[PDB]
RNA sequence: GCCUCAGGAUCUGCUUAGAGAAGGGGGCAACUCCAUCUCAGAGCGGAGAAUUUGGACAAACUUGGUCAUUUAGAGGAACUAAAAGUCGUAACAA
């Protein structure tokens, strides 16, 4: 019916908020640059992949607000969130040894 | 009972196959991919009990027939038997 397509519209709208946080935090290693570590840029990208895939969407939008609060200084937000995720015990510090 | 003609309860796999949507991904108006619970619907199948066509092997039973060996029998004709039964004295002596 039309109702199922309207629900599909609602669900893709809801999914739109989820995707762009995780990909904007992908890009924020590039707009804030790799902090002198483009040699381990791939390591930075996989580690922040673990960061965004270990968290929830409310601290995704909180960290998004924090990284548009400082566009060239997102590394403090990344290391802070790394400290929170290793304090949570969900994720190991050896995997995120660069920011922790 | 065995071998074959069938038979198909039942069970399983593969390819899709269309749909609901879970859920994620990428261009971010589009669109595409990847998973999932479900089933229409299609073949490709494979194993497959009960039952069943025909064949041969054929126990056992019935029917006679036949062989072999025992066995009943009124009655009959025996033969033998046994210290003195009766009739005659055929034979040994020409």
Residue numbers in the entry: 334 to 433
Tell me what the authors wrote about this structure, in their words.
Ribosome associated complex (RAC), an obligate heterodimer of HSP40 and HSP70 (Zuo1 and Ssz1 in yeast), is conserved in eukaryotes and functions as co-chaperone for another HSP70 (Ssb1/2 in yeast) to facilitate co-translational folding of nascent polypeptides. On the other hand, low-resolution cryo-EM structures of the 80S-RAC complexes and biochemical characterization have identified the contact sites of RAC near the PTE of the ribosome, and more importantly demonstrated the separate binding of the C- and N-terminal parts of Zuo1 to the 40S and 60S subunits, respectively. Structural analyses indicate that RAC on the nascent-chain-free ribosome is in an autoinhibited conformation, and in the presence of a nascent chain at the peptide tunnel exit (PTE), RAC undergoes large-scale structural remodeling to make Zuo1 J-Domain more accessible to Ssb. Our data also suggest a role of Zuo1 in orienting Ssb-SBD proximal to the PTE for easy capture of the substrate.
Specifically, the C-terminal end of Zuo1 MD (residues S335 to A350) inserts into the major groove of ES12. This helix contains as many as six lysine residues, and based on our model, five of them (K337/341/342/344/348) are close to the phosphate backbone of ES12. Notably, there is no physical contact between the main body of Zuo1 4HB and ES12, except that K352 and R356 in the first helix of 4HB (the extension of the helical MD) are proximal to the phosphates of ES12. This specific embedding of a highly positively charged α-helix in the major groove could tightly lock the 4HB on ES12. Compared to the 4HB-free state, ES12 is seen to have a large rotation (~15°), with up to 13-Å displacement at the tip. Thus, together with previous genetic data, a conclusion is that multiple basic residues of Zuo1-CTD contribute to its binding to ES12, and the interaction between Zuo1-CTD and ES12 is required for the optimal function of RAC in vivo. Our structures show that Zuo1 4HB deforms ES12 in a specific way that would pose a tension to h44. Since the upper portion of h44 in the 4HB-bound state appears to be in the same conformation as in regular translating ribosomes, the effect of 4HB-ES12 interaction on the decoding center could be very subtle. Zuo1 could potentially affect the conformational dynamics of the DC through the terminal end of h44, to kinetically modulate the interactions of translation factors with the decoding center.
